[PDB]
Design a protein around this ligand. Structure first.
Ligand SMILES: Nc1ncnc2c1ncn2[C@@H]1O[C@H](COP(=O)(O)OP(=O)(O)OP(O)(O)=S)[C@@H](O)[C@H]1O
Ligand SMILES: Nc1ncnc2c1ncn2[C@@H]1O[C@H](COP(=O)(O)OP(=O)(O)OP(O)(O)=S)[C@@H](O)[C@H]1O
Ligand SMILES: Nc1ncnc2c1ncn2[C@@H]1O[C@H](COP(=O)(O)OP(=O)(O)OP(O)(O)=S)[C@@H](O)[C@H]1O
Ligand SMILES: Nc1ncnc2c1ncn2[C@@H]1O[C@H](COP(=O)(O)OP(=O)(O)O)[C@@H](O)[C@H]1O
Ligand SMILES: Nc1ncnc2c1ncn2[C@@H]1O[C@H](COP(=O)(O)OP(=O)(O)O)[C@@H](O)[C@H]1O
Ligand SMILES: [Mg+2]
Lengths: 312, 312, 313, 309, 312, 312
DNA sequence: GAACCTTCGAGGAAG
DNA sequence: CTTCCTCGAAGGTTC
């Protein structure tokens, strides 16, 4: 499998790995579970993979679920009963869980017990459950999304960042070693430069280029071959997606560069507001294609020269 | 049947058709299942037809269902259990299935296994099931509405587009042969012009014109008879339909051509704004009948001269 | 009778009427049943009436039911067992159908057969029930809510439209001959003007004027009596009710045309929110007297010139 | 009895009353059933009373039920089977019937037949000629296809001072209480235009006259009783006067928001908006504005303050 | 007993008490049931207490229930029909009854009958159920929530008002004799002036001071003990709590008396916007310490002279 | 154990403790149940902990449940039937109960009875349930959500306050005994000054510092180790985060101390408009680093010296 | 003309 | 199916 299993295999995120190593080692001298950890940042950067590594280092099983998957208190109660001592519970998009369910975790995380009503009619009665020790791992896009009473109960916080070209190059070379394939260093660098700094995209592109090199080439990935393969896909010469081009083009042609609010833009491009906010705007801002102002977003001169317009 | 069964018979969609060929033959060389594929775009372009073509080229049994047909996780678990190695599962309107159902689809697509909670009260167990390799094929009219974590699982994407007159004329001819109807090469070109670029519409008109020529003619579809029949159907020589004319006419007469929002007073017509946004609006945009503006849609001079109103 | 029985008697709807006429003959020239037809349009335009005309002009027996009366797949089977070759099946409010039945309906429409369960427990078995050729006619007031697969099956589409003065005038004349009442053509036009384009409304107005004409007059509907009757009833020449007129006046006199919120307007006329939004407001929008905006309703220039008040931008 | 029995006894509603007389007399001349009638409008104006009058003029026996009592289609189908030719069915609070029942009523009204599934089989029942009468305060809640099948629509209006004065005098004779003509006018002004409110004040004044007087209502006893009840000569209550007073003396006539005004009088926000403001707006004492509500010149004159534009 | 039982013991409420006396006496001379009565107004002023007094003065048995207990028409139909001639039915929190249930009282209150369904299937029939004469009593804090047709059926309306210092002083002395406690008239007035006009608050203060007087004193309440106890509770001589004093001080010393917004004021005291607007601000306005204006809150001259500052 | 068990162990909250002591003793002398008490205030100050202490001082069994666990009236009625004379009932997060259930407590708290419907449903009647004497304890973070008639029934109100450095330092030392960690008195003061006056934050920081000193140290928290550990966690010596430091620096370097509007400032820091106002600005105002004004907010002299710039 | 504060109106989502 | 409530627009004042 492609997913790393141990910290020695996990490339990048040095600042996070440095802290997690110290807290995991200390928690292993003492015979007790690790404090609840919260990971936040852009999607697709590898925070789920981090949860598996933690479980393998602690030597316990990992269970996985998501906020939207829990709708009533009976769901969360049934899940917690299925945990063994020291197990790790991973909850994705924890910010999207219902408020009536969130207030059930408060007692579970802080004191390991839950008060519940059971039975029906004359049998209806309250019960006091006593849970075994466990570690919760939460995932969310931003810290300001969660309520103050919940955020205060997490003991560890991790912020994850985009990968740099030297890191993605090694990840691409690693992946191209599990597949019995050959890639030249110049090709690996070119393929990485197109991957928007995100490891998930890099794995998807490498698969498609591998197919093209088998049917349309000599079975080896080279700069001349990779250039054509990526040109056949919609990936621009600097990684911009077709959805990215739609946004930039709309701002210049229909809005004249702005200012425009992301809310109004979303309905004009027919994209869900949460996707443009969480997936597309973050990269476009951190790379100078879009600028933010008090009134709204504005396209920079770099965008005009890229899309082929005149920065009048 | 009318719909083609192999790539040799499938007309148009050259971009999509060329990509899938490379990936399909590469997947065979490796003797493995095809990656998950997402087909999206306007209705009636042949999205469903393409799913059958992939199944025949791979040589597998196709299974079919729709988003709204699945109501609880227990249903999808049964379907996923009823799969043979390599089977293709096609889900129409995937964007409409409930969030509670999508929970299971993530784990299946990512690792081919599912964990099902079972029991209630004192009964509280789960079972782990390993699925045989399969290929998921989804189809949607709305892409931007698809949940981001789901959209990231699809490895192959195809954007369907409107057919051009050379292709549509060839389709009109091919379809006429199955009806054993006699149509001249001139009359076949007339229907193509007014089909709005959608094969389903072209087939609808041809089926109706037959009944006209069998009474108002000598069973031969002549250009004059075809043109007289299309005017009887109220089909514009530009292919605008009853709903299309009703939109533009009200905008000009009641709002001086706009600008007006898509739902602002579309209540003054019967059509649900979702169909206007998904099936009527995109055609008019490509044909230059309407342009989008900061304040809504505005009728271009073409519409005025077409509808026969003096432009401002 | 009050309902027409043949295309000769069915006034108006020439576009849809002419199309159906051709398609029916082409089917009669062969041993084939008419294609499944879907009828669209606002309520009361004659959808139900058209179904009987189709059945009579086809020369076929009609079985009638409705969407609310069907609750489970077993109901359709019992009906399908009663149908006969070439019969027409009419289902009003087909959009009403419970989705569980909608899926099985596809096979009958497209394949003329359906699955049937027999036995119980270990003896449970599934078998096909074959069906003779038949034509389904579906009347629906809403189109975009029908599931896409169902819509793909329906072959012919027909849009019903509001009758215009030249045709609605003839319907009044025709109804005036079922009763023993004489009506002057000038009077018949005055009623048609106020019928909002709906045949059912024209008949209701005629019944009320008839009662007055035989109690407060000589039993004849002349232009003089028609004017007095339409004065007891407060229906404006545009067909605005007494309350409709009060709404417009209040907006212009007290708020300078608005914007004004729904709740504020309701308490001025002493009416419920739901009553204004559902009984009076809808027609005023169609005629273009008012518009809905983020800040509330606003009166248009057309409203000012009808009520007789000066207008200012 | 308090409820009038015939049109000659039914004071007011000249518009609705005149139309019904024409349609009822014409229907009799043809020996036909009366068209279906829907009565709607504000509370307490006479909707229920008018339904019984119609039955007495037609000379028929009235069947009575209510929306809340009909819970399932089987209930209505049973009631309909008991109808005889010319019978009148009256359904009060018709807006509460479940939609599963209203959809049955379409054909029963327009075609006089029902087709009900009932080993499952369909029985066709052909109903005799009958008239359905409905009364409701929320006519907008009825389905659009149901409203289209009623042939007569009666919209009720408020009453005038000369009509209410005669009602107060009539009711006083049933209580065998003596009341002077000018004393009756003083109650009519305070009745807000509603017959039920006029009767309620009369009952309270009768209690006062029997305990604090000689059991006779005169221009002197009435003024004392109305002073104890604290009802202004315009029909404003203690809380109504307190609202106007606060707006004029603390905010200079407004504009002021609903929340601020409610908190200043120690009232629940929903109670001020739904229980006091409606009458003040209809009488022209208050106006709603984009920035709040303001007291009009009529309010200054009534409360006794010098207006300043 | 802590709750008064007859009008001789019910202090205050002169307007409501005077009216009810006259209406009760007239009903007895006519020997008939009392008209329906609605009691409404602010919390804790004596609405529930007055309902029992009416029953003792009328000399009849009282049946008691509440809105939250009546959840379906079958319940109400079972409470009715069990009434005997002249009974009094008291429903507390009547505003909670479902609106579909309220509409059953319409004919019961006006005509003393209800329409019920009887029999089954083809034997089903509707019959009138006739009720004996009865008096309905309702109490609510949210009168505006009742339907217009229901409020119009109540024949007597009682709106409660706040008490005055002479009456509250007498109430404290009465309660001080139920418990074994001696209290000086000077001390009784000292508590009354701090009770915000509400009898329940006066009783609460007395209970708290009693605990101190028998633990830190000789078991007697006197001016010396009362002043010390009220200093521990930290209740200003105007009835202002510790948080109330902090609000006024902040407005005078930092903002020069205002205008200031609610958000800015809430953040400076570490409170939250909803508690300040719902718990504390209401009484400060009703007593004239704060004034609300289009620009913000402003402190009045009355506040300056209370806190000891100069109204410069 | 972490949670103090008795008033001798509960450090701080002198004002709350002093009152509770007097009221608890007076109740015991009379041999009566304690009056209903409501605890409210900011998160993590000790509300839950105090509820258990009160139960130990009274010497009675504690019955525990939570607001979100009570879904309907039948649940609450079942709990009340399980009470015994003198029992204490504790409802945490009492603000989450639905209004239809909250109005059942009105009669229970004042008169110890409840109206209930009983019977076969063919025949049924209302009946009183009579409750034994009991003390209801409620805890909530926002009292403003409780209806006015409920709050008026609580006889004892406890408002919690933030801890001072002298008291907060002792809590840090106490916790070091449980973890068996030697801590220098100087190091205890450093952690206390960075804990924002909140005990939960202080305990969280101590656990992180403890893990660091035992993995790369000799198992002693000295003044030198603490500085290194706190630098890794990135907690300023005033408890400010990098975001808080970024805010203050931007106002000083780009605006000369302001005034600046919230919208303009948010853009210059790449933060969300509403997040900054709800998350970070509250603590900056309370400490006096920022001051709000009618024209914007201004950095005070205290913020200048902390950042090292020269004030003018 | 940048920044704060209040009030209203129409959606939508939590029972 | 209904209540509750929250997001967006705009009128008005001050430096
Ligand atoms: N073209 C027509 N000529 C004469 N009478 C007509 C015509 N169209 C409709 N009517 C009459 O109008 C009345 C109502 O017609 P329907 O067909 O029942 O309306 P509808 O579409 O069924 O209304 P619904 O079912 O409530 S949506 C009947 O009395 C018909 O006889
Ligand atoms: N014209 C009238 N003359 C005399 N009494 C009248 C008149 N109209 C109404 N009343 C009396 O007013 C009271 C209320 O009349 P109703 O008919 O019950 O009002 P309503 O329309 O039923 O109000 P609802 O049902 O609550 S919406 C009864 O006592 C009637 O006798
Ligand atoms: N006039 C009075 N004289 C003596 N005690 C009084 C008086 N009015 C009220 N009380 C006491 O005040 C307390 C509260 O009165 P209640 O009648 O319960 O208030 P309330 O109207 O029921 O408040 P709710 O129900 O929460 S809105 C009781 O202990 C009464 O005995
Ligand atoms: N540091 C890394 N080294 C190797 N592979 C990685 C790394 N980070 C991510 N990946 C790969 O990219 C994908 C990341 O998926 P996942 O961890 O689920 O991202 P997320 O959890 O953010 O959705 C996986 O296929 C994973 O193997
Ligand atoms: N390229 C094509 N060649 C032949 N027939 C086509 C083609 N595209 C569409 N059609 C025909 O038009 C219809 C398309 O329907 P379908 O594939 O269901 O559209 P969609 O799935 O996009 O709604 C079918 O009847 C099919 O035979
Ligand atoms: Mg009470």
């Amino acid at each position: 499998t492609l997913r790393p299993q141990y910290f020695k295999e996990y490339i990048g995120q040095d600042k996070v790995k440095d802290q997690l190593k110290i807290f995991i080692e200390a928690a292993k001298l003492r015979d007790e579970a690790l404090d609840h950890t919260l990971l936040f940042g852009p999607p697709g950067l590898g925070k789920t993979t981090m949860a598996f590594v933690i479980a393998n280092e602690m030597g316990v099983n990992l269970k996985q679920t998501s906020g939207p998957a829990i709708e009533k208190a009976g769901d969360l109660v049934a899940i917690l009963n299925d945990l063994e001592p020291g197990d790790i519970l991973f909850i994705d998009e924890i910010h999207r869980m219902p408020m009536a369910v969130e207030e059930v975790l408060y007692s579970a995380m802080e004191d390991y017990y839950i008060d519940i009503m059971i039975g029906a009619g004359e049998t209806s009665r309250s019960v006091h459950l006593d849970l075994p020790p466990f570690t919760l791992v939460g995932a969310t896009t931003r810290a300001g999304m969660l309520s103050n009473p919940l955020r205060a109960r997490f003991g560890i916080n991790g912020h994850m960042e985009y990968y740099e070209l030297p890191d993605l190059t090694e990840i691409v070379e690693r992946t191209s070693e599990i597949f019995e394939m050959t890639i030249t260093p110049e090709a690996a660098l070119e393929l990485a430069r197109r991957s928007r700094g995100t490891p998930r995209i890099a794995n998807r592109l490498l698969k498609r280029v591998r197919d093209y090199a088998q049917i349309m080439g000599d079975g080896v990935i080279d700069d001349k071959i990779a250039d054509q393969a990526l040109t056949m896909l919609d990936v621009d010469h600097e990684g911009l997606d077709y959805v990215d081009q739609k946004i930039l083009r709309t701002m210049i042609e229909m809005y004249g560069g702005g200012p425009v609010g992301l809310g109004t833009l979303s309905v004009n491009i027919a994209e869900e507001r949460e996707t443009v906010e969480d997936m597309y705007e973050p990269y476009l801002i951190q790379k100078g294609f879009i600028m933010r102002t008090r009134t709204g977003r504005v396209a920079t001169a770099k965008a005009y020269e890229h899309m082929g317009y005149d920065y009048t």
